[PDB]
RNA sequence: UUGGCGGAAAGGCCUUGGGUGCUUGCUGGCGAAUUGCAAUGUCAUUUUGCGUGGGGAUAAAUCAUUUGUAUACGACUUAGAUGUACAACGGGGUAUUGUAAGCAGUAGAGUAGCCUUGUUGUUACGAUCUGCUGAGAUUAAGCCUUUGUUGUCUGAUUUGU
RNA sequence: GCGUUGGAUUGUUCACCCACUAAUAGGGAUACCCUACUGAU
RNA sequence: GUGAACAGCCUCUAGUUGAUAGAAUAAUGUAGAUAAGGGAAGUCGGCAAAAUAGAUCCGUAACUUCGGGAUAAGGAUUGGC
RNA sequence: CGUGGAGGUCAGUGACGAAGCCUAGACCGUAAGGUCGGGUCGAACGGCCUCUAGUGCAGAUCUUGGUGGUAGUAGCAAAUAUUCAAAUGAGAACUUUGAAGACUGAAGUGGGGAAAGGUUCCACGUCAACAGCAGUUGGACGUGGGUUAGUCGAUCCUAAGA
RNA sequence: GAAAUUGUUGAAAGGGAAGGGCAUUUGAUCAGACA
């Protein structure tokens, strides 16, 4: 028989941060300009999608087929600083950080943990070190230009630009896949206190990796933890413990849309011709509205709603046809998931119901 | 005496994870602390400087109480009481060398060279 | 700061998924806690008329909403916690909808 | 004091300038006693403290509270000091069911009925039906939204190279 | 490295069929108490 | 009142409101329930759970010690004005 | 070597502190064991030659008594269910009253009896114990009060029977 | 008013063992004789 479990994710404990931390990146290619290797946003809900299908040879070629997607809030993302990393015979070593002369209340509120009692003195000496000349800064920058075979940039989100209310910014580091590390840090230095799209990293007809932390479910025992049957000790004998809130990594994820907040009628295919953003009736379920850019990707990401995720651009040069097919949407369901949704727009609600006692 | 205890955070001041909020012990105890503050005031002592220097507690004789349980047995059931005492005190913000001649002449020579 | 108020309080969103024999008593504590939040005092007193109003539909039949009068007051001597407390008595309506909080004028 | 170099775990290695000494490179003068024949005969270096007189900067965290992306208890994540604030209600949006109390009717099998003896006599009762009625009630407790009203917005503790 | 089935028949392992699938190979190894294991500060 | 009833359910007369309490919903337990589609394949073993069950109309075989088996089986019906 | 007692002996020690006890304070003896100093303590006791015995302990699923871990753990979880204000008092999840909510639902959580129990019945006062929580309450504790017969019954009859 | 056992203070030590033996170090503590 098989074993009622895997063995790879074996120390089934909770992770240490809700930010699932990037561990891998595709290595480099020092011929291109710089391309950001990752991005991050906040998962919001699911929808259903039909899609006409250019899949040569498949049974469903040139047919409509319904599939199911998710959605994530993807505001613009501002850069605040960089770090270098050098190869050793130990591994890698953080040797310098540098920050960007003016920092948001959000990230100042991240590094502090009890905000309002704080004097909010986070970088007041660093901005003073940003002198008339920036001498020490350029000292500790050109160092990295010399050293630091590979380099990362810090980001933070603009979370006030979401329906969510947490007030706090989720830092991260992001690796680059350009060359000319001097050019990398020069590019980033120009990008200091400057923000970046998600259609400026990704596009359609793309595959991604989705790394996040799962929904928690508490201390569920064997019968629902491992799907094991019901009536010294070894470490693979299917004993009860914590489920959920593990980190995971989900790959081979076909994007269909790279949305846009300013673009009205985000739910518009070529077919619908209806001025509706994808935010369906009722708001999202435990998430609010989508008045920003977004992504529509098939399958189902690890997470729960109003949870953060991190994105990576598939980490290698894929080989399957499905990694290269050309997407064409036909219709977005835009109904409320707060019930068995029937109607896309409240004007359609008015139209099919008619006028009512409260209407006049 | 810290077993099968639910843990809670309010001991993190003390650097300890396990803690609990007894009432009865505390009622008797602050009875005593009020008695001792009263007695120090009776002596005519200050309380603003005053700290507990010594507390003490030690077992005491048991009630022989009972209950009745399975297989027809008087299995005992009984107390664990306490003597208590404490002493409170006003805070207060407050040899010759045998040696040898070989060691003596050396230091005398260091003086001799000390100009 | 002697003050009186009206207040609504929504029990359907405070007594969801509860043991039937504790739906009604728990509402008492929820009401006192509501006074503790809004008025900002811990020692609370109630009305047996209001207790009737809560209990009248049994224990597992408590109404989804009520409407209340609250009167923070001074206190008598050496009730050592504070010179103030809170008192709670109901006010009668065919519905507690279309209402909202108000300071009632003084007479 | 000058300019260099070095990131692998650099924390050091050079070099300019002078200042400052000592020179056993050569030759002189003075002193060494007494630890009594030796007794490690104490010379370095780690850390810390109290005092010294001189510069330098004047914060977090935890608890309590609240949320809940988490939840055995702990923990992890959030919010809160005069505002893009936070909350309790209320409105609006979604959905949930399935058409309320209050009445009115020339619907209402029928049976009596005061007699204006009908020729729908009308008056009594009368399951229900028809209309005010997709009406009514509910809606976050682990939904959306808010220019509304009304309140909160300085409580305890601990920490130092 | 990964996999080796659903049934029919006896208290009984002895005995031996039907059909699928790629195959349906053979073997061994009260319990709160301290330990180990699963999880948590 | 109910209904065949002294079953069970509700109530008046009368009497208790006693059974250590509080805050929380993690599993698993203990008692109690529901589950599509198939319908005892599972299992030594229809163990337990579940199925009809009340009242009326028709009807109820073989076998027999003719007395029964027999609430046989099996079909229909059950409200209110 | 040591112990309980006995015959002698040291004109023995002894309130100016015998005996016992404690003591990482000393000395002896290879060792059993002895000796000493300090502290505590308060009235008898020891050295030697001899005697006599109920004479020496790690143990006996030993005996009696006491005390520990386990542990502030298991557990106080059947009996639908309790809630608000006032009084009392220092103190109320629990006593009393009052307003609501429930129940036994008359083959009862009602009112009376037999056997048995024997002051539990009633008041006042009261909590150190008991009421497996607490208690200002109670069948608990202290002090008292109270059981009225020509007709109910026993006694009388005889039953199987002794 | 002993012992198990228990607490407070003082000293010391401590990574899945403790206790004991031979010698010594560190720290505490201590008797004797010099005439």
PDB file of C-alpha atoms (C1' of nucleotides) in Angstrom, chain F residues 18-21, chain G residues 83-84 86-87 92-96 133-135 137:
ATOM      1  C1'   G F  18     -31.551  21.747  45.218  1.00  0.00           C
ATOM      2  C1'   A F  19     -27.272  18.891  41.870  1.00  0.00           C
ATOM      3  C1'   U F  20     -19.850  24.001  42.969  1.00  0.00           C
ATOM      4  C1'   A F  21     -19.803  28.272  39.590  1.00  0.00           C
TER       5        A F  21
ATOM      6  C1'   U G  83     -31.679  36.049  35.953  1.00  0.00           C
ATOM      7  C1'   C G  84     -32.274  41.648  38.102  1.00  0.00           C
ATOM      8  C1'   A G  86     -33.176  46.182  47.915  1.00  0.00           C
ATOM      9  C1'   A G  87     -32.124  44.564  53.174  1.00  0.00           C
ATOM     10  C1'   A G  92     -23.006  37.381  48.812  1.00  0.00           C
ATOM     11  C1'   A G  93     -22.830  32.903  41.739  1.00  0.00           C
ATOM     12  C1'   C G  94     -25.362  30.425  46.884  1.00  0.00           C
ATOM     13  C1'   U G  95     -29.287  33.532  52.847  1.00  0.00           C
ATOM     14  C1'   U G  96     -34.289  36.369  53.048  1.00  0.00           C
ATOM     15  C1'   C G 133     -17.099  25.116  46.476  1.00  0.00           C
ATOM     16  C1'   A G 134     -18.251  29.422  49.738  1.00  0.00           C
ATOM     17  C1'   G G 135     -21.894  30.355  53.562  1.00  0.00           C
ATOM     18  C1'   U G 137     -28.048  29.946  55.870  1.00  0.00           C
TER      19        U G 137
END
